[PDB]
Amino acid sequence: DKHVNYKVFIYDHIRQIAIPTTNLNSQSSLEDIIDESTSCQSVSTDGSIEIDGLTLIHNFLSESEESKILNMIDTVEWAQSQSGRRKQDYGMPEYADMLLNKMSEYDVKKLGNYQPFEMCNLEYEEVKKSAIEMHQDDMWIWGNRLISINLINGSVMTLSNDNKSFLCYVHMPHRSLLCMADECRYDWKHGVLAHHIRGRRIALTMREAAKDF
């Protein structure tokens, strides 16, 4: 753990702020996150922070929508990625248009006007011990908003801030959408630890370019 002596926060999806907690650590179990995530509303705002650009929307997809998408996903072949992951590189998929619209309908200001260069499905699997390390995309090549939709199972998106030694867990439930922009995009690195994966999960990624080139 690089985050062993970090200050750990939990994201309150209702108040849309990160509360510090002593009940979590850098090696917290997936259950610990969920219990703290649902119990942090009554906790004090003392020491809390606001992470501008972090947008979690519960139940972004319905079960019909998800089922339709998952069936279309599995027709296409899976490539090999790193750290026990697989991928499908796309823009091309028919279900992209739908997702872009729903994103605009919920919020035209933030999630509208979105033309991503890449749309990528990232398959996780508990048995492979799939994961993605803490990292950040360069602002000179990659743009503002990073979308991620939780298919099959939810998980936890771990955020870090090295300059301030802040660790933050965002519980992403089944069929939730996480948009990462602004501060969250540019001042925080993001990752998903192996012990936060429940069975199989497919993260439906999107990302826009910084420039047309």
From Swiss-Prot:
EC category: oxidoreductase
Binding positions (2-oxoglutarate): 122-124
Binding site for Fe cation: 135, 137, 190
EC number: 1.14.11.51
Reported phenotype of the disruption mutant: Mutants lay fewer eggs.
Cofactor note: Binds 1 Fe(2+) ion per subunit.
One GO BP: demethylation
Cofactor (UniProt): Fe(2+)
Annotated effect of mutating residue 137 to A: Abolishes ability to demethylate m6A DNA in vitro. Reduces fertility and results in a high proportion of male progeny (also known as a Him phenotype)
Domain of life of the source: Eukaryota
Transmembrane segments: none
Molecular-function GO term, any one: DNA N6-methyladenine demethylase activity
Subcellular localization: Nucleus
Cellular component GO terms held in the UniProt record: contractile ring; midbody; nucleus
Main subcellular location: nucleus
Catalytic activity: an N(6)-methyl-2'-deoxyadenosine in DNA + 2-oxoglutarate + O2 = a 2'-deoxyadenosine in DNA + formaldehyde + succinate + CO2
Keyword Metal-binding: yes
Record's keyword annotation contains Transmembrane: no
Keywords: Dioxygenase, Iron, Metal-binding, Nucleus, Oxidoreductase
All copies of domain Fe2OG dioxygenase, residue ranges: 53-207
Functional summary from the UniProt entry: Dioxygenase that specifically demethylates DNA methylated on the 6th position of adenine (N(6)-methyladenosine) DNA. N(6)-methyladenosine (m6A) DNA is involved in epigenetic transgenerational inheritance. Plays an essential role in DNA replication and repair in the germline during meiosis. Binds to components of the DNA replication machinery such as top-2, and directs their localization to DNA to control DNA replication.
Membership in a protein family: Belongs to the alkB family.
Subunit structure: Interacts with top-2; the interaction is required for localization of top-2 to DNA. Also interacts with mtss-1, his-24, ule-3, C18B2.3, pgl-1, ceh-93, mcm-4 and F37C4.5.
Protein name: DNA N6-methyl adenine demethylase
Residue numbers of the full-length protein present here: 33 to 262 of 291
